[PDB]
Symmetry: C4
């Protein structure tokens, strides 16, 4: 290649083809969250905006294990939380409070196509400290000047997020957004990892922050949406290899 | 759905049908504990009250790996510890001291149908600090005002537990109770996770407690028995998918 | 049962039958160490005294992954380190320095039939602190008054161990001994776990030691060789289920 | 055996045979990194010098998951970064900045045949502290006087590395080099582990360094290139058993 083609979604011939791709991609993302162990109980939601109606969203149904997510399980929800399509008999239900956090962000930011939230271990533990993410590794520079902190309702979270790619919700955990499902997933994986790294390092000693000019330089390379798409790609390759036959149903 | 149906056990046509469901559910719970790595050596017991005789209990047999538990292995024990049914030739034996902790609680609290105890890593490590669980995450609010601490015999533990869903046993580990096997399991999973979270955060820095009104609000949503049932449900879905064919024997 | 039969090895009809049992049991133990992740590089040795000649020992061959150990791979070594039987062409070799640590202990203590050593993560990290194991959990009471600490050659280790079940070797890791392979394995699993627990708890706060009378009481229940045999049993059950077909070859 | 034969690569009849061996070995190494969880996003590169042209290198193609690496995926790159052979249609691309770090080292040190770099969790976290690796375990003595620290461009890293086997790159992670792929891999595995160990121990208390004469003694045994080859060998045995059929394609 041909790197450019690898940093963007494939071309879609029809809106129906795009919808089919996006639903499978959302399921793959949910399966990645289970494979990484990012899920806890029934908390967590991953949404993608429908490609035909911008006020409709595909989401995981409430209570179904991320590890068992399939395309047939996804439900369609309108902006106000009404379940209007998809799913299986017996679980055409959405976690409303959780969904309306996403809905508020999708409404505020038209370019945001996907949002990820889960009560992952390290993000949760780090969020209990009410500290900003320290920019102490090359990988963390994806978040330089681009991660919010709420010292904590849907409106309040959307306002706090502004135009940033991610937010640390105090005493709660992590939420990320993307122009693609893929980039939102990359940002969640990377943020959970850097929270893990900070908990390890801060317990052991005193970190040295990356000098800000170097952090800015690295952000140009790692922090934009095409870079996010590419940085997520090996996780999607692997989950398709491991569980694609299962989750495509 | 139909969320209400998902937060309660299925209806049982006969007492025999209920017993068959409960034995399989107890085995699934034991298999979840092994899959989560909550077990250590031969410590640990999970009990469920028999649906016909309130003074009889199904329990794992002493020394059998949780990872290999099957319905045929479970033994029936009366209130005073006599093995009176079930099991396989050669292992119709109960860990008595451990069982009588459960027996004392079941006797004191008729609504408690299931009790979980295991020497899980993070609960054990946290219990060695003799500190109450800090309410620092949304998930931890399931335990707001509802987790005991014993600064440590069966009677003493039952008295310390009072009407709460869980107890941290100093220098020992965790024990949880439920009106269902499912809720007892949810509380154990959630408590082990929050102990892990507190060990991570306390090593790294100073946590910020959730403001008490917010904790109380979240407890109303996460802390009751139907919520416990629902919060456990993905773990039972997954373990059935992974190992159901094995453990149903 | 029938608990007594579960706390001792089976009866052996002939010395040949005993040797076959012990070789398979040693392989199972080595496979458990790999499954627990206790191994690192090519470090580590597990030995069992031959049942016919007390000056001969079965041991893993140098450089073979614990994960791939089979009965056919084990080699027979005399007291002075000469490889005198067993193994496969191309790897009839023993790690001599490591083996002679075991040899010195086997010589000093005729009742010691099995010895385990591996550079496991938590034992290694804890050993770098040059501190005695704190008795802060019920499980740790298996080591109450019965674990040595060397502030560190084979003779020096044997002298430091005295009649105890285990030793923490400063800047090195853990070594355990048993009257059976099973009990030596239980002590290693339990000691590695308690080192993990102490590292977690000490990083987070101040532990509270178990009161010594309570520790002594619990040691009577957990610390003797029959209890060790029983406490190891679920690990052997599981590894046989997972990998027995492989490792029996 | 026959230990000497186990500490060196097999003899190669032709340059073509050597190239085939080395490509498979590089893929096995990449698969080990995935199996150990050393990879993160699309970061990381492992290179081996071509056996016919010393200015040509085999490397993983940019963006392909380490877990899915196969011999057919590897690409051939010249000293200046031009992709000149190998790979599959659509991913004949190299991460240039990352590769030129390797290129600078390969140019400076003709004996270095293989270089490993990945953004592994513990190396990354430890590198954020800007501290030298403490020599506190027997395993760590492989790095006694032989690991660099850059208080951080390709030239700067090569200069900082000097003739040492490994370097801790501040705020970045780990890089190792070897006269063989195998030894470079051993050094990476061992360095990542010792970073993990130091983070654990430093959080818990005060480590005791190994006395320098003892560290020097142990380095003679663990720190040379033949020892590295042997110390890596169980990881290659295991990954071939688990995934060889996949990655040989
Ligand atoms: Zn949430
Ligand atoms: Zn207990
Ligand atoms: Zn050793
Ligand atoms: Zn890098």
């Amino acid at each position: 290649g041909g790197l450019a083609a690898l940093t963007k979604p494939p071309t879609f011939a029809t809106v129906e083809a795009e919808r089919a791709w996006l639903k499978e991609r959302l399921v793959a993302a949910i399966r990645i969250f289970a494979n990484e162990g990012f899920d806890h109980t029934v908390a967590g939601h991953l949404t993608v905006r429908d490609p035909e109606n911008k006020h409709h969203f595909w989401v995981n149904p409430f209570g179904l294990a991320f590890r068992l997510m399939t395309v047939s399980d996804l439900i369609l929800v309108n902006q106000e939380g009404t379940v209007i399509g998809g799913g299986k008999e017996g679980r055409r239900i959405v976690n409303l409070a959780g969904f309306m956090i996403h809905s508020a962000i999708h409404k505020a930011r038209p370019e945001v196509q996907a949002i990820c939230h889960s009560h992952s271990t390290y993000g949760k533990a780090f969020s209990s400290l009410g500290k900003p993410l320290a920019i102490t590794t090359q990988d963390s520079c994806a978040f330089y000047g681009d991660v919010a902190l709420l010292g904590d309702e849907s409106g309040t979270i959307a306002v706090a997020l502004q135009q940033k790619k991610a937010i640390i919700l105090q005493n709660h955990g992590l939420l990320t957004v993307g122009t693609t499902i893929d980039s939102a997933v990359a940002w969640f994986i990377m943020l959970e990892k850097q929270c893990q790294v900070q908990l390890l390092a801060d317990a052991a000693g005193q970190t040295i922050p990356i000098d800000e000019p170097q952090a800015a330089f690295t952000f140009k390379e790692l922090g934009h949406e095409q870079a996010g798409y590419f940085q997520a790609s090996p996780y999607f390759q692997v989950i398709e290899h491991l569980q694609g036959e299962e989750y495509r149903k």
